[PDB]
Design an enzyme around this catalytic site. Structure first.
Site, short mmCIF file in Angstrom:
data_model
loop_
_atom_site.label_atom_id
_atom_site.label_comp_id
_atom_site.label_asym_id
_atom_site.label_seq_id
_atom_site.Cartn_x
_atom_site.Cartn_y
_atom_site.Cartn_z
N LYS B 51 -6.41 7.99 1.88
CA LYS B 51 -7.24 7.68 0.73
C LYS B 51 -8.36 6.72 1.09
O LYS B 51 -9.41 6.71 0.45
CB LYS B 51 -6.42 7.06 -0.40
CG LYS B 51 -5.16 7.79 -0.73
CD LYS B 51 -5.30 9.29 -0.88
CE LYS B 51 -3.99 9.82 -1.52
NZ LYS B 51 -3.51 11.20 -1.25
N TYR B 261 8.34 16.86 -6.41
CA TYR B 261 7.36 15.91 -5.92
C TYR B 261 8.07 14.55 -5.86
O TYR B 261 8.78 14.19 -6.79
CB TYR B 261 6.18 15.81 -6.88
CG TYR B 261 5.32 14.59 -6.65
CD1 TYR B 261 4.54 14.47 -5.50
CD2 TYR B 261 5.32 13.54 -7.56
CE1 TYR B 261 3.79 13.31 -5.26
CE2 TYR B 261 4.58 12.38 -7.33
CZ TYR B 261 3.82 12.27 -6.18
OH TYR B 261 3.14 11.10 -5.93
N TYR B 287 5.49 12.46 1.30
CA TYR B 287 4.41 13.27 1.89
C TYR B 287 4.55 13.72 3.35
O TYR B 287 4.88 14.88 3.63
CB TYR B 287 3.08 12.53 1.77
CG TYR B 287 2.76 12.04 0.38
CD1 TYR B 287 2.22 12.91 -0.58
CD2 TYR B 287 2.99 10.71 0.01
CE1 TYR B 287 1.92 12.48 -1.86
CE2 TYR B 287 2.68 10.26 -1.28
CZ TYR B 287 2.15 11.16 -2.20
OH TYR B 287 1.87 10.78 -3.49
C1 LIG Z 1 -1.99 11.24 -1.34
N1 LIG Z 1 -0.89 11.08 -2.31
C2 LIG Z 1 -1.35 10.65 -3.51
P1 LIG Z 1 -0.92 8.95 -3.84
O1 LIG Z 1 0.57 8.90 -3.31
O2 LIG Z 1 -1.20 8.80 -5.29
O3 LIG Z 1 -1.80 7.94 -3.05
C3 LIG Z 1 -2.11 11.26 -4.32
C4 LIG Z 1 -0.93 11.56 -4.70
C5 LIG Z 1 -1.35 11.50 0.02
C6 LIG Z 1 -1.26 12.83 0.59
C7 LIG Z 1 -1.78 14.07 -0.07
O4 LIG Z 1 -3.23 14.00 -0.02
P2 LIG Z 1 -4.14 14.78 -1.07
O5 LIG Z 1 -5.58 14.58 -0.72
O6 LIG Z 1 -3.75 16.24 -1.03
O7 LIG Z 1 -3.90 14.21 -2.46
C8 LIG Z 1 -0.64 12.99 1.86
N2 LIG Z 1 -0.14 11.93 2.53
C9 LIG Z 1 -0.20 10.68 2.04
C10 LIG Z 1 0.38 9.55 2.86
C11 LIG Z 1 -0.81 10.41 0.76
O8 LIG Z 1 -0.87 9.12 0.28
#
Ligand SMILES: *C(NC1(P(=O)([O-])O)CC1)c1c(COP(=O)(O)O)cnc(C)c1O
Ligand SMILES: *C(NC1(P(=O)([O-])O)CC1)c1c(COP(=O)(O)O)cnc(C)c1O
Ligand SMILES: *C(NC1(P(=O)([O-])O)CC1)c1c(COP(=O)(O)O)cnc(C)c1O
Ligand SMILES: *[C@H](NC1(P(=O)([O-])O)CC1)c1c(COP(=O)(O)O)cnc(C)c1O
Lengths: 328, 331, 338, 329
Positions: B51, B261, B287
């Site tokens: 992010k 999820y 994730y």
């Molecule tokens: C992102 N996961 C989020 P969050 O846990 O709210 O920060 C959004 C649900 C994320 C992802 C998946 O990425 P996307 O761009 O597909 O949303 C994969 N891996 C990690 C570690 C995340 O934080």
């Protein structure tokens, strides 16, 4: 001196970055320029930290000796044991960790989150209580153990890592085109500050390395730093003697005990995190951070001074003190 | 294409390193060469992650518009919300987070450790919905005298939200130059989608869009797949991709998302341990443990051409581990 | 003395039982005969305890004044607030609880298990304050009471432990009454009584009650407040106010209030190694559990006393178990291996 | 029948009290009169509960055989294992407990609070995982003699006696009350609790009035165990009749989603009952039997004017293992 004589097994990404803490600097009066060298962001091996820089000089001896198991020790939320567990897996070695109850603290998930949790996932054999019993245990099982003392400190190669640190800083000052006046570092088992003292004695700044005690047993820690600096200076051929004057260790920020933070620790963690986006822990860095902050606030730093804060790591431990931070 | 057109605010250390996972590679049979691009170690801002790369392209707009507060959303152990609070603090901006109960999970310290813990320390006003909150938070900022910049879940459904990972593809090409060879595939976990979207766009630039193997972690494959395709196309237009994203360009494996999820299956746990124990590289049960699971399973099934070089993208998320302590009590 | 003058609302099952602690007695030398009066098992209202005995005398007033909401205060794992919440739901009254952190303690699930967990399920409005707030400094107490009125209800104020309240000492004078009735059956009298003391009206009532037959100085209170001086004074103060209230044909003397200060450390809410050993020994010899805050400390006191020989050989000591077991959940790490 | 034949070691305070749940009753329409028998408040031994009443008939055999160690089994948050650890300590016997993960649940302090925490404090040797046979054997190999207590005490010869006695008590108390209870709601999982009630109430032709509420989520298996233990027990006390399948009533509607996991209705029932009476029930067992009894009354499944006796079997300490679910009540 000559550090190059000793082999270094790469466990990090490379030299750790130095960042300006302009917002915090400004918040305190803009009279002292604070920086941060990110030792806490030096490796992909389970967050790494200061102990990982150290381990780069021990690994070679471990391999040279043909050891197949790394054995180390520490408190329950030890950063060291966690790093050794990661390094181990990365190298294909087994790992035995002695986790002792070094802190008068009792959190419900203290032995199940943060550092210890990662060590178990990393496959280490985590023994909660011993040292010799573990070592012998390894031999008796048919393996050859490599003994890594607490924090890698009281070990012949234990101070080499941070001698290199001072090296790196010089190289980086060249690029920046200026020299840092002081360095703030947290000290407990000692070889971190020790290596710094030796390395910085090399250019007449050993006394500019400001150690902040987090053991709450300043006398022992001070003596261990001094003793290790002396052994390490000889090891690297320092063209000089490490004097008591070369070891600065502030004792004002360690209370109330090792592993336990005071109100100032928490306030320091918050201010720093809220002004720079940089987290510190209740055990070590929050205490060195507190010390640096308080020093600037007191005028203890000459106006115009550039201070380099060494962030040694330790954040995962934040999980063992959840209730204290429930509302921030 | 032209990504340089959009400004990028520095939040990372620089290009994220690629590391070979030789032990895991050998463990599986030595037929597929596994690697990892460490997005999980890209920043000094509270551990960062994927992010944070994305946020580099939203911030300039936030600053341009003179916003004084960053507002975002996610579940209790959201990685996104924590990164947003770190970036906020770093920038001297206030921060408001809407944390919702997105997971049918109930751990004693679920809302007091890991990601959310860091957010509160970072100074964010962390709002737990009971048990419209979003527009309620945005307005609370205005009514307070400030100006909020709205950051949707994962930064995903946002115009600038996919730029971050087009640059990721950019980075990999430059790295492949030094390496002297091109990776055959890329594994990336997908939930709100713009991470994969940016990759599909950026790799479509050299005809490798279909080589990006998405591993669903939302357990709602269809929606996720749709959102990835839509963000990919919006983004392709934003950067001037000299092509159109086809549905075939969006690959998303639905086999390793279960059961829900935020909840890992036994495969996830096995995967996490195996990778952790062979490379000293940790992954989470929400994730990355799932994408790692998928990759390992793909290799184990021979679904990858022998000799292939597969680049695993570690997006981050490890701090959430603290919210699942019991499952890992004995390792 | 006349206690029958004041009305008592039934909240308990009836007199609480006294059981011999034969194994613990034998384990300690067999020279002193230890017994236990189970105030901890006195009710079906969320485990009850000593505070439920005291509430029987306050409720009649609350109902007579037509109060629709009970309001009380206490630490995070306070037993008092939990019993108030149960009693309240049982009576059809709303309940507001002001809880602050009275202990330099920070367990991960401190505010979500044991006593506080029950108060929330019991429907009470549990009002906590972040660290540094200081309910004592701000006056969360008065803000709660006012908020109830402002809302259209009438609140009945119940202070910490019911102790510093006119009717607060009544409950335990009845306790002395019970003990004599029960001594009749036993055909003998207990030489002493061990009771844990913090806010005061438990021992206070006992002192009044037992002064009526010259056994006031036989009530050995063990301090769990770590502030023995204040505690001692409040006991003495409550005992005198209560004595006058029940028409005790005597004046309570400074010598009638005994408070041992040796087992309260290191602080209120925090146990010492001795406390823990006392808890385990009592538990492993009798199947009777005590907590790290209160009972575990009085128990420590009583055991240490017997081991020291501070009790005349042949003496029969009556241990009052005031309750508080649920608090154990707030100290899980401590007992992780037993 | 003749229960007096078998020796009962006193582990409780005596007959358990019966209280009216007038508020709950009025809240639900006032067409059915709800009462509660407090088995949960039956002993000073670590909170006791229904398993403690059952244990009153097993101890004599244990002692008569000279066993020095009590060995039992159950899930992490087992009430039975806690009660056996307390009973043992009280008797001067060693204690070994096999704690298995019978619940798909993973709370951070699950194996450190409530029942299991007390057991460790009571001095029992708590083993977290043939597990059963291994324990029994380890005791012997240590030089001791172990008394085997199966889960819930249920699949044991003496296991069903304790609650035949329960029916006896109720008859006695109905005498004083000057009336008889039309139904009885009881929670069932391993079975000897409802089984014993079936046998004892069969004595006055009320066995089909004992409404069992399943909390195992495997009704068929639980129903068969009750039937099986009831029959064996009836033969042991010499019931002048055979236990028919119609004698065993088990409602399957409130055990979801699984054993050890509550549903929304469970939580509602727990709150409604705590907030109207000051009586707490847990999310594993009693909260489900309570859910059941409430839904029954709300559906009119009870004839107007009925007097239903709710058997509260205990288990409240388990509440601590589900802290997040009740963080806001
Ligand atoms: C992102 N996961 C989020 P969050 O846990 O709210 O920060 C959004 C649900 C994320 C992802 C998946 O990425 P996307 O761009 O597909 O949303 C994969 N891996 C990690 C570690 C995340 O934080
Ligand atoms: C009462 N302790 C209280 P609380 O923690 O609010 O329930 C009041 C502080 C208590 C005592 C001491 O009784 P006093 O009359 O001296 O206050 C002893 N034992 C237990 C279990 C208590 O709950
Ligand atoms: C008994 N539940 C047990 P445990 O959790 O091991 O103590 C056996 C699974 C129990 C029951 C059900 O009684 P049965 O005779 O049908 O087994 C109901 N209520 C409570 C509180 C129990 O502990
Ligand atoms: C090192 N702290 C350790 P551990 O918690 O076991 O990993 C050794 C006690 C440490 C230090 C202090 O370094 P020394 O060389 O003086 O021992 C400072 N900061 C952090 C984050 C540490 O982990």
């Amino acid at each position: 001196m000559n550090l190059q004589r000793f082999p270094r097994y790469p466990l990090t990404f490379g030299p750790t970055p130095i960042q300006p803490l302009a917002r915090l600097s400004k918040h305190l009066g803009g009279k002292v320029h604070l920086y941060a060298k990110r030792e806490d962001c030096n490796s992909g091996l389970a967050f790494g930290g200061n102990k990982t820089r150290k381990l780069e000089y021990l690994i070679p001896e471990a391999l040279a000796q043909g050891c197949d198991t790394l054995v180390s020790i520490g408190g329950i939320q030890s950063n060291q044991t966690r790093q050794v567990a990661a390094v181990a897996a990365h190298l294909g070695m087994k790992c035995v960790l002695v986790q002792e109850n070094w802190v008068n603290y009792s959190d419900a998930v203290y032995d199940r989150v943060g550092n210890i949790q990662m060590s178990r996932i990393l496959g280490a054999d985590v023994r909660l209580v011993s040292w010799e019993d573990a070592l012998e245990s390894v031999r008796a099982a048919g393996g050859k153990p490599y003994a890594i003392p607490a924090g890698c400190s009281d070990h012949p190669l234990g101070g080499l890592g941070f001698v290199g640190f001072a090296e790196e800083v010089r190289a980086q000052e060249a690029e920046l085109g200026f020299k840092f006046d002081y360095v703030v570092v947290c000290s407990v088992t000692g070889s971190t500050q020790a290596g710094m003292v030796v390395g910085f004695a090399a250019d007449g700044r050993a006394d500019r390395v400001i150690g902040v005690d987090a053991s709450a047993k300043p006398a022992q820690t001070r003596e261990q730093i001094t003793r290790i600096a002396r052994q390490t200076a000889e090891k690297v051929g320092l063209e000089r003697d490490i004097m008591r004057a070369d070891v600065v260790l502030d004792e004002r920020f360690a209370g109330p005990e090792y592993g336990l933070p005071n109100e100032g620790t928490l306030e320091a963690i918050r201010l720093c995190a809220r002004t720079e986006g940089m987290l510190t822990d209740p055990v070590y860095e929050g205490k060195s951070m507190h010390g640096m902050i308080e020093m600037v606030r007191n005028g203890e730093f000459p106006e115009g001074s550039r201070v380099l804060y060494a962030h040694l790591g330790g954040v995962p431990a934040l999980n063992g003190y959840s209730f204290i931070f429930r509302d921030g």
